[PDB]
Amino acid sequence: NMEARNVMSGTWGELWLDGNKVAEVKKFQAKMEFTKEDIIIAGQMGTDTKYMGYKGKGSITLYHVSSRMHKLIGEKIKRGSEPRFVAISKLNDPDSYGAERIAVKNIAFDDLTLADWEVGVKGEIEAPFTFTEYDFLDII
Amino acid sequence: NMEARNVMSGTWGELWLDGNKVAEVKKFQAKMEFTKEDIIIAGQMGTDTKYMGYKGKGSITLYHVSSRMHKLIGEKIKRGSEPRFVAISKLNDPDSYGAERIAVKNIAFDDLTLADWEVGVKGEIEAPFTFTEYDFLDII
Amino acid sequence: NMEARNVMSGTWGELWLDGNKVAEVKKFQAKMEFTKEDIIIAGQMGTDTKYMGYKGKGSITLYHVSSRMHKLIGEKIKRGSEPRFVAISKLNDPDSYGAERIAVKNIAFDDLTLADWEVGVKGEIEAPFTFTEYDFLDII
Amino acid sequence: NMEARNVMSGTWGELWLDGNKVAEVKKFQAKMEFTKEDIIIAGQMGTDTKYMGYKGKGSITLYHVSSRMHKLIGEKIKRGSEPRFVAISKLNDPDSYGAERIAVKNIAFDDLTLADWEVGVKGEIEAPFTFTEYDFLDII
Amino acid sequence: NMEARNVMSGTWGELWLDGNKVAEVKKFQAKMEFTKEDIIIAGQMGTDTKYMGYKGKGSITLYHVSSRMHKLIGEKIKRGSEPRFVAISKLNDPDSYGAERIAVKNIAFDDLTLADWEVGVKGEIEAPFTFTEYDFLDII
Amino acid sequence: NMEARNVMSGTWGELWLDGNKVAEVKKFQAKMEFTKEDIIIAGQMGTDTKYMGYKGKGSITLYHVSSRMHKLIGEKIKRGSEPRFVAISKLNDPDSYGAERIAVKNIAFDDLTLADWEVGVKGEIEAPFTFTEYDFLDII
Amino acid sequence: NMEARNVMSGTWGELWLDGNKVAEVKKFQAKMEFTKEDIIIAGQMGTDTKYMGYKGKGSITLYHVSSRMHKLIGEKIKRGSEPRFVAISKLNDPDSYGAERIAVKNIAFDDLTLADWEVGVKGEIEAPFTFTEYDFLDII
Amino acid sequence: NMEARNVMSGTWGELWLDGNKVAEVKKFQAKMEFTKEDIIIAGQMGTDTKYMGYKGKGSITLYHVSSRMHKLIGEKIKRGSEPRFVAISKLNDPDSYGAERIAVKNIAFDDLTLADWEVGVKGEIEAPFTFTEYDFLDII
Amino acid sequence: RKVIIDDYIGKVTNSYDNKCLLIVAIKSYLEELEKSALIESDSTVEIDFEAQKSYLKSKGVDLSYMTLQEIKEANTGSKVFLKAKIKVLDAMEDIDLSIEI
């Protein structure tokens, strides 16, 4: 049942941002961090926990082909309005059986990289973000 | 559409400082860090955030060809007056389509490097700074 | 205009300490760190800063040819009097145009290294310090 | 079936570069290097690998009849633009079962040889390259 | 018992690849590389090792009679699917004590050679591979 | 005393493996590699070393008369159990002063060669191993 | 078109160094090494590269007729100033199609050979260098 | 001008070590290795280098006529004191244009060879060294 | 027919290389038709071996001692012989379904 070829490869992934395909994508990551409070019950030695909520974090790294991120948020940040976006990730490896597609909703970015370059080095842009809700589309 | 040649290279960039071209430039970086506060809404598990403001940070690294930084700020720092400058960065790669030019305004430097050298090592100067406002000139 | 040969080399530097030339000098560094306070102005998103003062720091590293540092401060430290010195640094590279000479005044050292050696390792002494005032002599 | 005469000989090859036949050719070689990662699966001693991609490499060696290689890329390299070429290799031995033809695309060269000569030695020029795509034409 | 004539000769081998006999075969080699970790046990000077697994490696070299290697994997590699083959090697020398046969399974190839020729030199193609399993058939 | 005839010749050796005499043996080698750490002692320029242990290594090369090496370990290796063997080497030259015999214990092999043949070449199989203990029997 | 006589011979070259013809020249070589970075693009197995710059390298070998190499740089190197030279190479074979001439500029040498001799051996001196620019003159 | 007879021959050299002529000399070699750092300048593809210093290296090989090398440094090395020598090399070929002489100063030797011999082989001793300074005397 | 008439009749010399170029052009046209999903993507174009052999036999040359590869590139005067293999898609018109209770 378990074979080496079944392991997913990241080369076959693709990312959509606000309904526009991002072909210049290097890596994508979305994570859900739970919040747990320590609870001690009298009479038992093992310490227990209570679950209260979660926080969503992630980041996107992409090559510096064009100035995509500036046009998205640069003007609105100055005014005081914070935009919200939706991202869709699909991972379709031909050797693996099935492709998983997940939608990440209500995204807010942490920073804007106006300019960053160095002599003899190719340019890359990375931007972390936080989200609130997700959705499953054709999980394996 | 996406090709390897389209990636911008940092060798083709150039920097202007206070209207004078800086040919001895190694790397330039300007970043905008947002400020966000956690907000917990009763009835929903996911934590949400509110955006309040941004802080701008960056740095410039250059070879030790001449004593450019001293003449800019050294005398005024002692007296008590803090100068403010404007920087312009243009990144024009022949393979990539279009060149992006961004102006960073109201710059204040963090430190002054009076002297730094070691035997058998070439000299370099780096200076971080904070800014307030930016401007877009012919973004891709 | 900009050429590779114009970059200054640290091998051509030299240092004077209390009017006596230090031939056994490995590296020298003097830096001025500014103090800035965050200021938030109502009505604008970007945070601004106010400059209040500066603090000077540096260090000297030298080979263990002789016991120079002991005779300078060892006896006076025990009594309770803290000496103050003056250092002069000159960087004269034949390929570069011009040599910069800077004087650093009111120096106070941070520590005294009584003894430090290991088998099969040559001996070196490093001593950080703080200063108050500087002066420019024939900057480029 | 199998016989000595069926083995192909390199004297019968020919090479088209950028649509122009190269008559002063000595050897031509193209290859694809796969990328594989070791994966250890619990319960099995033998290690298994997962295929992730390939890299193409090759070289051309030709007699120094004329300065062909300069006119292609010499002036373009300095300005900052990299050209891409297409090569076709045909191996037609009368004794063997017909001929095989292959087109190698997206060729980018590794180096340019301005001058290379020695007293008493005939001149030769070898140029390695990397490619991405290929076609099969009249494979046996 | 032991005599010179009993030594096997390589001229008498043959190889089946994917169920089809390969007649233009020059050499075939398979090997299993064990993985061992050094362990120092208190009270004993001699170091001892623990066996952890094995890795399989090999290669095939054959005359360039026909373009057999392309038709197997050339189109599949680009699409992202990796095939696995089975090879059988039989060594039957009339002088030696009978013949030995071995089946090597789960073979995955390391590279593909599109073209390789040189003037005045006969053509040869060598392809290395890795495997995981094996059987013994008619071992002596 | 010393004479040319006294030198031992390799033709007169023989090797027992697991209690069975191996007649098709080409060469046999065993060695012990000591482990020594450099220690610098104050007041002395010459560095001195401390002996900490030894590691045993060796190899056997034998004509490919029969598939002896497979029957020993081929099936056991896959299942996950590693066997240990004992080898005895005797070197008995009529001209030299008698014969010397040594037993090498706790032998574990490094690799297994499933198949290795080439057209026009006699077959040979070489197997390296590691050991831990040894005895002296009839040393000269 | 193609014929054996058309191949250029190294006996017919000549080299000018700093405007003075060098008659005792054995070989001359110049080359440009491009700098390329691997870039993986999502959805494609074949890796693609981005060209970032080039580096120039070469060497000169000449019979030890006279102490020419010393007079150029021997005294200047000690003082701390590095000279830059210009070399011109002309390859004029009567059988080939004309001659090709190239100027290599901004040459800086790697080492200086004070003395090198051995009994019964003719003397030779080889000096490698690095360059930055070049011109084409009468290219075929 | 240039002729075969003008090439210097190594048989005509001689070497003075510490003011005493060495007659049993086989070869002598000295060299100066420059130190250069790569520097990338914005707007130019070709990389340029900056010269920072040099390192001197060489070796002497001589027939094992007498135990000359021991008497120089054998007893001094153990005690902890390192001597420095001066060597002069003269190359005087009757056919060439005169003779060239060079003095190599501040020589420190790398190793000392206590004993080295083998049956049926003549003895030779080679000693490498490092230097710092040099003079030109009667350069051609 | 239009593509061939426009650029190939009377403007090129009937050599093997020109035949290969014409084959490449036809293959490119078929690949262009591929993206519109009118036919299948397995199309192949090559020299009509049997027709060429028959024409050569008619012209009188002897093919007993002629290699198979030699026949492909032999002279044919003005005539050119080619063959292809394409598969044409059709609309959905019959459907079979079996639901397992």
What's G43-88 look like in SS3? CCCECEEEEEEEEEEEEEEEECCCCHHHHHHHHHHHHCCCCCEEEE
How far apart are alpha carbons F78 and F63 in whole angstroms? 25
Name the strand (E) or helix (H) holding D85: strand D85-92
Task: Compute CA B111 distance to the chain's CA centroid, rounded to the nearest angstrom.
Answer: 15
Q: Are residues E134 and F114 in contact, defined by beta-carbon separation less than 8 angstroms?
A: yes
Considering only alpha carbons, which residue of chain H is nearest residue G117?
H10
**DSSP 3-state of B8:** coil
Whether A95 contacts chain E with CB within 8 A: yes
Ramachandran bin of F35, using left for φ above 0, alpha for ψ from -120 to 50, beta for the remaining angles: beta
How far apart are alpha carbons D55 and D33 in whole angstroms? 5
Which residues of chain A are within 8 Å of residue B28 when distances are taken between CB atoms?
115-117
How far apart are alpha carbons A64 and G50 in whole angstroms? 13
Task: Find all residues with CB under 8 Å of H85, minimum gap 6, and list them.
Answer: H17, H18, H72, H107, H109
Burial of D41 (C-beta count, 10 Å sphere; 0-12/13-18/19+): middle
CB contact under 8 A, I68 and D92: no
Distance from CA of B63 to the nearest CA of H (A): 10
Distance from CA of E126 to the nearest CA of D (A): 12
Structure token digits, residue A113: 């990289």
How far apart are alpha carbons B40 and B49 in whole angstroms? 8
Name the strand (E) or helix (H) holding B60: strand B48-63
Burial of I58 (C-beta count, 10 Å sphere; 0-12/13-18/19+): exposed
Whether F45 contacts chain H with CB within 8 A: yes
Helix and strand numbers, DSSP H then E, in chain F: 1, 9
Q: Are residues F97 and F91 in contact, defined by beta-carbon separation less than 8 angstroms?
A: no
Which residues of chain B are within 8 Å of residue G45 when distances are taken between CB atoms?
none
- Is chain B touching chain I, with at least 3 CB–CB pairs below 8 Å? no
Whether G19 contacts chain C with CB within 8 A: no
Distance from CA of A4 to the nearest CA of D (A): 6
CA-based nearest residue to H104, from H51, H52, H59, H53:
H59
- Amino acid at the residue C132: T
Listing DSSP states for chain A in one string gives ---GGGS--GGGEEEEETTEEESSEEEEEEEEEEEEEEE--TT-SS-EEEEEEEEEEEEEEEE-SS-HHHHHHHHHHHHT----EEEEEEE--SSSSS-EEEEEEEEEESEEEEEEEETT-B-EEEEEEEE-EEEEES--
How far apart are alpha carbons C137 and C101 in whole angstroms? 5
How far apart are alpha carbons E9 and B20 in whole angstroms? 80
- Is chain I touching chain G, with at least 3 CB–CB pairs below 8 Å? no
How far apart are alpha carbons A18 and A25 in whole angstroms? 14
Phi, psi (degrees; rounded to nearest 5) at I83? -145, 155
Give ∠ CA B58-B59-B64 in degrees, rounded to 5: 170
Task: Compute CA A38 distance to the chain's CA centroid, rounded to the nearest angstrom.
Answer: 29
How far apart are alpha carbons D138 and D91 in whole angstroms? 11
Best C26, C57, C136 member to test B by mutation, with max B CBs in 10 Å, is C136
Instruction: Give whole-number Cα distances, H62 to F70, H69, H83, H101, I78, in Å.
Output: 56, 10, 20, 20, 82
Burial of I32 (C-beta count, 10 Å sphere; 0-12/13-18/19+): exposed
Structure token digits, residue I97: 């379904």
Strands B48-63 and B25-39, by their bridges, are antiparallel
Distance from CA of C116 to the nearest CA of B (A): 22
**DSSP 3-state of I21:** helix
Structure token digits, residue F79: 């299942």
Whether C33 contacts chain B with CB within 8 A: yes
Instruction: Give whole-number Cα distances, B49 to A84, B35, G88, in Å.
Output: 11, 10, 68
DSSP-derived letter for residue B71 is H
How far apart are alpha carbons F28 and F57 in whole angstroms? 11
Position of tokens 């008369």?
F65
CB contact under 8 A, H43 and B12: yes
Q: Are residues G42 and D53 in contact, defined by beta-carbon separation less than 8 angstroms?
A: no
Which residues of chain D are within 8 Å of residue G2 when distances are taken between CB atoms?
23-24, 65
How far apart are alpha carbons D115 and G13 in whole angstroms? 10
Task: Find all residues with CB under 8 Å of F108, minimum gap 6, and list them.
Answer: E36, E49, E51, F82, F83, F84, F85, F129, F130, F131
Name the strand (E) or helix (H) holding B79: helix B68-79
CB contact under 8 A, D94 and I67: yes
Burial of H7 (C-beta count, 10 Å sphere; 0-12/13-18/19+): middle
CA-based nearest residue to G54, from G37, G36, G35:
G35
Pairs of residues, one from chain A and one from chain D, whose beta carbons lie less than 8 Å apart: 15
How far apart are alpha carbons F16 and F89 in whole angstroms? 7
Longest dimension (CA), chain E: 65
Longest dimension (CA), chain G: 65
Task: Find all residues with CB under 8 Å of D1, minimum gap 6, and list them.
Answer: E23
Phi, psi (degrees; rounded to nearest 5) at H13? -85, 165
Instruction: Give whole-number Cα distances, G25 to F86, G30, H28, H129, in Å.
Output: 66, 15, 23, 30
Whether A9 contacts chain D with CB within 8 A: yes
DSSP alpha helix (H) spans, I36-96:
49-59, 68-72
**DSSP 3-state of F59:** strand
Kindly report the number of other CB atoms within 10 A of residue H78's CB atom: 11
CA-based nearest residue to D85, from D99, D102, D68, D103:
D103
Position of tokens 């170091």?
E47
Task: Find all residues with CB under 8 Å of H130, minimum gap 6, and list them.
Answer: H55, H56, H57, H58, H107, H108, H110
**DSSP 3-state of B87:** strand
Instruction: Give whole-number Cα distances, D104 to B3, B93, B102, C97, D28, in Å.
Output: 18, 28, 42, 53, 11
How far apart are alpha carbons I1 and D96 in whole angstroms? 37
CA-based nearest residue to D60, from D32, D39, D29:
D29
How far apart are alpha carbons E44 and A96 in whole angstroms? 50
The residue count of chain B comes to 140
Ramachandran bin of C98, using left for φ above 0, alpha for ψ from -120 to 50, beta for the remaining angles: left
Name the strand (E) or helix (H) holding B53: strand B48-63
Listing DSSP states for D24-67 in one string gives SEEEEEEEEEEEEEEE--TT-SB-EEEEEEEEEEEEEEEE-SS-
How would you write chain E as a 3-class SS string?
A: CCCHHHCCEHHHEEEEECCEEECCEEEEEEEEEEEEEEECCCCCCECEEEEEEEEEEEEEEEECCCCHHHHHHHHHHHHCCCCCEEEEEEEECCCCCCEEEEEEEEEEECEEEEEEEECCCECEEEEEEECCEEEEECCC
Q: What is the CA radius of gyration of chain I?
A: 20
Q: Are residues C24 and C128 in contact, defined by beta-carbon separation less than 8 angstroms?
A: no
Task: Compute CA I4 distance to the chain's CA centroid, rounded to the nearest angstrom.
Answer: 13
Listing DSSP states for chain C in one string gives ---GGGS-BGGGEEEEETTEEESSEEEEEEEEEEEEEEE--TT-SB-EEEEEEEEEEEEEEEE-SS-HHHHHHHHHHHHT----EEEEEEE--SSSSS-EEEEEEEEEES--------TTS--EEEEEEE--EEEEES--
- Amino acid at the residue C138: D
Phi, psi (degrees; rounded to nearest 5) at B109? -80, 155
How far apart are alpha carbons C12 and C101 in whole angstroms? 12
The residue count of chain I comes to 101
- Is chain D touching chain A, with at least 3 CB–CB pairs below 8 Å? yes
Q: Kindly report each contact of residues H119-125 with a partner whose C-beta sits within 8 Å and lies 24 or more positions away, as own/partner.
A: H122/H63, H122/H64, H123/H63, H123/H64, H124/H26, H124/H61, H124/H62, H124/H63, H124/H64, H125/H61, H125/H62, H125/H63, H125/H64, H125/H69
- Chain E neighbours (≥3 Cβ pairs under 8 A) are A, D, F, G
Strands A25-39 and C100-109, by their bridges, are unpaired
Pairs of residues, one from chain F and one from chain H, whose beta carbons lie less than 8 Å apart: 4
Name the strand (E) or helix (H) holding F48: strand F48-63
Give ∠ CA C6-C11-C15 in degrees, rounded to 5: 110
The residue count of chain H comes to 140
Which residues of chain G are within 8 Å of residue E80 when distances are taken between CB atoms?
45
Partnered with residue A117 across adjacent β-strands are B28
Phi, psi (degrees; rounded to nearest 5) at I31? -65, -35
Structure token digits, residue G9: 């011979």
- Is chain H touching chain B, with at least 3 CB–CB pairs below 8 Å? yes
Q: Are residues B11 and B27 in contact, defined by beta-carbon separation less than 8 angstroms?
A: no
Whether H140 contacts chain B with CB within 8 A: no
Distance from CA of C6 to the nearest CA of A (A): 18
Strands G99-109 and A111-118, by their bridges, are unpaired
Whether H77 contacts chain F with CB within 8 A: yes
DSSP-derived letter for residue B122 is B
Which residues of chain B are within 8 Å of residue H50 when distances are taken between CB atoms?
122
How far apart are alpha carbons A25 and E97 in whole angstroms? 62
Listing DSSP states for G88-127 in one string gives EEEEE-SSSSSEEEEEEEEEEESEEEEEEEETT-B-EEEE
Instruction: Give whole-number Cα distances, C41 to A74, B132, F19, H66, in Å.
Output: 21, 12, 93, 89
How far apart are alpha carbons H113 and G96 in whole angstroms? 56
Whether G116 contacts chain H with CB within 8 A: yes
Q: Are residues H123 and H117 in contact, defined by beta-carbon separation less than 8 angstroms?
A: yes
How far apart are alpha carbons G91 and G7 in whole angstroms? 11
**Span between the terminal Cα atoms of chain A, in Å:** 15
- Amino acid at the residue B127: A
CA-based nearest residue to C106, from C127, C129, C74, C76:
C129
How far apart are alpha carbons A90 and A16 in whole angstroms? 9
Whether C119 contacts chain F with CB within 8 A: yes
CA-based nearest residue to F15, from F5, F7, F23:
F23
Which residues of chain D are within 8 Å of residue I68 when distances are taken between CB atoms?
97-98
**DSSP 3-state of B11:** helix
CB contact under 8 A, B94 and D80: yes
CB contact under 8 A, G32 and D118: no
